[PDB]
Ligand binder design. Structure first.
Ligand SMILES: Nc1ncnc2c1ncn2[C@@H]1O[C@H](COP(=O)(O)OP(=O)(O)OP(=O)(O)O)[C@@H](O)[C@H]1O
Ligand SMILES: Nc1ncnc2c1ncn2[C@@H]1O[C@H](COP(=O)(O)OP(=O)(O)O)[C@@H](O)[C@H]1O
Ligand SMILES: Nc1ncnc2c1ncn2[C@@H]1O[C@H](COP(=O)(O)OP(=O)(O)O)[C@@H](O)[C@H]1O
Ligand SMILES: [Mg+2]
Ligand SMILES: [Mg+2]
Ligand SMILES: [Mg+2]
Lengths: 50, 469, 469
């Protein structure tokens, strides 16, 4: 996800279902959009396994 | 022939039977007649449901007192329409489109249906331009957006209407575009007060007023917002000039929808609200938007039932906004005006890439200090301030001074207290609150931060209280 | 002929019509067909109610998407039956009795109906033999009963699945009998995890797994526990040798029964549960028992909705158990694992006549110390610890060390802390907590008690922090 807190304490693996739960205006959409944006290098790699 | 016939009358909801093949489409406007000589009128019914067996359930927009079963119902063929154009600027209108101050006016205008579709997705663009008002708390912690949607949440009697009037004074007077004001299910005295004060402030010639107030059947209070929104949509699409839209208590639209739903015989959802709460709220709020190149700055007051912010109505409204100013009764009881809860209120442009680094840093520091104060509030309530650490005592002093300096004497508060208003530029606000959160005013008493403007007002009040900066 | 006809399909509940005299009995299994090529399958329907006029209301065990009104429904003349025998060991099965990893396996076995009556009262015998697990807190405060009924209570995501995996590691790995694992409405990732981890430990060859998970319709989640319980009942009554029965979140049985209670036409009970809550829970939970001379050591996980132990489902489950390990989220939030609430957990063999005088005395002293600490916590949080007595400060230090020493590094949590697991005999636990309550380690820091095993691990970690004992 590119986030220290998530990648260190609540890590997410491929195939896992992690719930982003919270109040409004706490950074849920921020966390998810950053998770999406962090895959840019994986996309630019080229192999379908990354 | 093809005319209908009233069958059931359950409050302001009327069931009408039509000859087969002549069933009116949904949202169509039908006309019935009440002949009782004191209540003689012509009811405008709006088709809501097709019940089957050629029955049609409609919502009456006028009280059905005196309506008889079996009377003739005339299908007009089109939905309820309102006048649109330049001519609507300067006049007061109904939910049905009737001019109130000058009856019969506007009947020759172009008439638009009040049921439109929201703009396409490819037309939408996010709005991230700051709208500077002159209030310290609004400009610092919840900056408003040009062409974005703004709301003022609050319980009963916390200052929603006074803040609406403050924003009318600040934004609508120096404005170049056109303004629309919908009063949905609110006081009629306030509608008259606003009409008169806009007439005298020379703002009425730019403002169109549409009023469906507390003494109206739920259909009127459900459709008046759509009428005003139709006029605003005309001003945005056909003329394209920087519309402003003020809506007083959109929650009354929600509540009238609740009552209408109860009368239509729908199953009640959680709390008791209609099952189609979010759907109606979205159908309404998605037309209040700025398209690419055409602007509508919107500002709505949202009532919070029983001071319950988890109520389904405001909780559903929250998702449709760019800046939400939340007024608390805890802040209102301390004499702070506007009674803005700084920790609950928010804005989507409080972002270092929009407002700048210093604005955002000062805002985050203010919010951190106030959150620490709120964390300590329990201990402070039982043991007082004397038991905290020295760091915590310093922070609580700074936080009391900050929460008092977010208060301000508003232009609309001169009618209650007699003291005129105050405007504070945003750069001066940032500088002042930077100095507060840095500790440059920890010697000035707690008062003298109360209901003032910038730093010059603070200096004057402190020197009148024997202090200096 | 004598077949049925689908009349109504409302979600998972299907109404079927049969000719007079060919009405299937209650709990029979009927077969309908879905011929849509993307969803083609054979629906199994369990007769739930006799609606009258030859109508029959059944619950479907597969999703009803693609089912047409009027299709043929074949009455099998019997209830749902599952394969039984010493040949089900080593295989993953269905709620219907179908092998998942090797389809077709078991169609030539003896098949037992999944509906039984509980053993007669004259065959019941109390079990008062301790099952030594190896966990400090479990062996001390919640001693498990050998041949008795054990449960793990707790909210969503505290310790239940990890604790059941730990107990499969401890009790089932070196067992001389059979193990049956029912995954009732749980995750499928965890089911595959358990399958693989039992194949690794060479335990799968002795274990029979029956899975009906969260993605299944409520019929499967309602009947999978009965299928696995029928397998265990065969291993207890016919073979007669030391069954172990693990059930993950059995509650899902109650919840699946609650999802269809309104579709079956029953008025809802207090908290939205079915009116037949306790009755169905008793019909199921009374078959999970050890008769005289025939042992079934049961161990269930019980989900507590929203951490509310007053919810009717856990409150009704509480009455069927000999030992309860109740997990808290307050202990989960402090990092203490397993997150057992020592003040809420209980066991019926915590009796001076069963566990001995010293075990019981040490357990009661630990409980008293922790209760006094829980009573002082609020004072300490508001007024500070220095306001207490010297006796109370001594007790607070002891209680913090004790509540940290009840935690342990489990074998099944190496995936979460990287640390290998520990095992502590019951006598070492008794003597260690005796020394703690007496005060022999009041000079060792609060750490070095946290996630360790016996007294040797305590010495190691204390010296790792510069201390002795
Ligand atoms: N890690 C972060 N650091 C700083 N600011 C953040 C962070 N995450 C989010 N924010 C800020 O929080 C604001 C709102 O967050 P976000 O919109 O992601 O919350 P949300 O869960 O989507 O709430 P809602 O759905 O009600 O809008 C954004 O303006 C963003 O600038
Ligand atoms: N900024 C202010 N300064 C002084 N008094 C105020 C201010 N705002 C509100 N009040 C007082 O509180 C009351 C709030 O009423 P209002 O906010 O209009 O009700 P509502 O929020 O229900 O529309 C007003 O009658 C006014 O007397
Ligand atoms: N003994 C333990 N050590 C470390 N972490 C644990 C332990 N027990 C539970 N956890 C944490 O709790 C999480 C979920 O616990 P689990 O028991 O699977 O939830 P549930 O009780 O709802 O099934 C795990 O991911 C794990 O990180
Ligand atoms: Mg969001
Ligand atoms: Mg008001
Ligand atoms: Mg679990």
């Amino acid at each position: 996800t590119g986030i220290k807190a998530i990648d260190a304490m609540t890590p997410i693996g491929r195939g896992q279902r992690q719930l982003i739960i919270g109040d409004r205006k706490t950074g849920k959409t921020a966390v998810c959009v950053d998770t999406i944006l962090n895959q840019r290098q994986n996309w630019e790699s080229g192999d379908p396994k990354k | 022939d093809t005319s209908g016939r009233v069958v059931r009358v359950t409050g302001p909801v009327v069931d009408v039977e039509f000859p087969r093949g002549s069933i009116p489409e949904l949202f169509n406007a039908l006309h019935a007649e009440i002949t009782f000589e004191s209540l003689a009128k012509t009811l405008t019914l709006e088709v809501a449901q097709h019940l089957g067996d050629n029955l049609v359930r409609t919502i009456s927009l006028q009280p059905t007192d005196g309506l008889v079963r079996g009377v003739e119902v005339i299908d007009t063929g089109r939905s309820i329409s309102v006048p649109v154009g330049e001519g609507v600027k300067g006049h007061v209108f109904n939910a049905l489109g009737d001019c109130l101050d000058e009856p019969g006016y506007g009947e020759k205008f172009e008439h638009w249906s009040i049921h439109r579709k929201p703009p396409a997705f490819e037309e939408l663009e996010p709005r991230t331009e700051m709208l500077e008002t002159g209030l310290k708390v609004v400009d610092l912690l919840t900056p408003y957006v040009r062409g974005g949607k703004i709301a003022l949440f609050g319980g009963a009697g916390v200052g929603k209407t006074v803040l609406i009037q403050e924003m009318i004074n600040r934004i609508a007077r120096n404005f170049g575009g056109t303004s629309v004001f919908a009063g949905v299910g609110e006081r009629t005295r306030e509608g008259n007060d606003l009409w008169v004060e806009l007439a005298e402030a020379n703002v009425l010639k730019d403002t169109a007023l549409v009023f469906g107030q507390m003494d109206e059947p739920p259909g009127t209070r459900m459709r008046v917002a759509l009428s005003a929104l139709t006029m605003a949509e005309w001003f945005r699409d056909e003329q394209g000039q920087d519309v402003l839209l003020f809506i007083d208590n959109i929650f009354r639209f929600t509540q009238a929808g609740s009552e209408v739903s109860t009368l239509l015989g729908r199953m009640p959802s959680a709390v008791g609200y209609q099952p189609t709460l979010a759907d109606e709220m979205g159908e309404l709020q998605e037309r209040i938007t700025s398209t690419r190149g055409r602007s509508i700055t919107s500002m709505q007051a949202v009532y919070v039932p029983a001071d319950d912010y988890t109520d389904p109505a405001p909780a559903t409204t929250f998702a449709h906004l760019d800046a939400t100013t939340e007024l608390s009764r805890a802040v209102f009881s301390k004499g702070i005006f506007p009674a803005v809860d700084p920790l609950a209120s928010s804005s989507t442009i409080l972002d270092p890439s929009v407002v700048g680094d210093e604005h955002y840093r000062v805002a985050q520091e203010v919010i951190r200090i106030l959150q620490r104060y709120k964390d300590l509030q329990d201990i402070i309530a039982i043991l007082g301030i004397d038991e905290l650490s020295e760091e915590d005592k310093q922070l609580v002093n700074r936080a009391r001074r900050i929460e008092r300096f977010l208060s301000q004497n508003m232009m609309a508060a001169e009618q209650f207290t007699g003291q005129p208003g105050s405007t504070v530029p945003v750069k001066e606000t940032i500088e002042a609150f930077d100095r507060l959160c840095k500790g440059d005013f920890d010697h000035v008493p707690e008062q003298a931060f109360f209901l003032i403007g910038g730093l010059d007002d603070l200096a004057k009040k402190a020197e009148s209280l024997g202090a200096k900066l």
